[model samples]
Target chain A: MRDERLSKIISMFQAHIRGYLIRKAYKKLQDQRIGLSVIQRNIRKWLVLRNWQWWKLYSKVKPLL
Target chain B: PKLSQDEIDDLKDVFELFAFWDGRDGAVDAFKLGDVCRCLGINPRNEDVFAVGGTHKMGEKSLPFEEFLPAYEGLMDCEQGTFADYMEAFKTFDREGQGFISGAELRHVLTALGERLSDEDVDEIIKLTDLQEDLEGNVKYEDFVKKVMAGPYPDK
Candidate 1:
């Protein structure tokens, strides 16, 4: 089961990406990129591993997950 | 692509870090450090791969792969920092008890990194890892370890 909370953080990050750029442009962009794939991969691994406790990270981020 | 002074400075810092790696060549065991892991497609963990208190472990008690990516990239761009983090990342990714990252997994990690890899490149890296691997599609951890720990995770 996917957590609804973390999805919000993911969406928040996606929105963050939509905004304008600055000197730290790459930092935000990189974090977003890392956040998207890394979290997805982590969830995938957890799902595959059949554990849900670790799912809290996402939930903690945005309770929707 | 020509880099601006800022970018050049950044790269210089990275180069300097790797230079330290070069300097420490004598201290590290290439056969075990790079060759052993490269042959497997995985890089072993060093101190930097761990978190504040995390240390290297050969078993399943490694850190998350997410933690390692940044550390690994840092290693690839070594002039700005030390090898501790990269090594920590290596320790984590090799969680499968396998010494190296497989061609499949490496490709996936690269994809996650916003980088792309062709099939040939993957195959070549594995080949570099395990020339002994024939139609069976199995590369040893040592190959991956040895290759990467040697110097420069050459992009394919």
Candidate 2:
């Protein structure tokens, strides 16, 4: 893979992690005064799914042996 | 960060192997083709989508500041997390515990990507994934694998 592709793949993983954290934070906030928007919740959920897809791809591409 | 120098070299080997296999009249079989496509998420049914997204087009090759990238980067962060919280997301998607996403579910994913296809398109794709024998319209898992392995899909 091109360094660019590799970087892109890595960055994708990075973004998912960030989103996951944000959702966790949002959930914590939800426990407080407000909850995340339905749209926001949906988007986060989508991101979570998308994130998993990339990670699967990432692990497959990463060296194992 | 890019792959390690070793990975880069190994990938080159991978490319060369693929090229070598592809250069033959019938170097590979339906099964071999599907295996690679499955691993890479190449949906073979829709010629247009398949061709557009294949490695040949270098699709998803760019990492612009967009959803694809953000979504991607976010996942990487999971691995970097002290606790592997990313596991939840993975498990949910793989609800069946098959360790891989199913084609039916993948359809929704492609739909989300704004590549919503008509029933015709869907049928074509399902056929291409070769994941089934539609003789009576019942798809088999093996056919799905074969279709995926085929050249991403219609090269044209």
Candidate 3:
């Protein structure tokens, strides 16, 4: 049981700490398809979502006034 | 070496992502060797490896996508250290609690972090990270981590 606990800790450190960086770098390099235009377009989409949410909120409150 | 289609696409993405200069016809074209080196955490002193007209052609003091891809791939094989800690460090500068960090916020946080970077270094960090030209100069947290992982000071 003690040996099993040590093995788990080592694996967790490798997978989470060191492995996270390695995985992230690999993703960045592999997902090089992600572009600035894509990011900008997503921002625009987010703004539209916010507007929609505000409209829904206003509609819900309209009956109270 | 012949590049696979996926590798080629990856190279193209890297070029477009790092491009800071305007090319002909309003296209984002190229990146300076210095900037590229900065991104990769490599020294640019080797003319044969980094200079234009060597392995990569030099046009307008920047490496266009055609020449830069091979050079970039060649260097990408080198070992870069872990960066999970650096990402944690960057969160401190994110005052808005948003995943993105602003250049203005970085400027203040950078000085407070104990190490006094030169004004030039601070400005360079701002320029490299700031994707939006607005004075706010926002950088997404993931993008921020990516650049730092590629840079020399990740351990710091």
Give TM-scores for every candidate, taking all chains together and pairing residue i with residue i: 0.25, 0.22, 0.29
User: Model 2 chain B, poorest ten-residue lDDT window?
Assistant: B74-83
**How displaced is residue A60 in candidate 3, in Å?**
48
Which residue runs does candidate 1 get wrong by more than 4 Å?
A: A1-65, B1-84, B95-103, B129-142, B149-156
Greater TM-score among 1 and 3 belongs to 3
lDDT of 2 at B49: 22
True lDDT of residue B100, candidate 1: 53
B1-156 per-residue lDDT for model 1 (tens digits): 333567545534433332233333323222122221122222222322232223333333332333322433443332221234334434455656665555565456433432233456545554543445435454444444344334333335
Top TM-score prediction, candidate number: 3
- List the DockQ of the predictions in order: 0.01, 0.01, 0.02
- Per-residue lDDT of model 2, residues A4-63, tens digit only: 443333333333222222222332433432233455678888788777977778877788
* Ranking of all candidate structures by their TM-score, best first: 3, 1, 2
| Alpha-carbon runs more than 4 Å astray in model 2 | A1-65, B1-92, B100-103, B133-146, B152-156
In terms of lDDT, the best-performing candidate is 3
Which 10-residue span in candidate 1 chain B carries the lowest summed lDDT?
B29-38
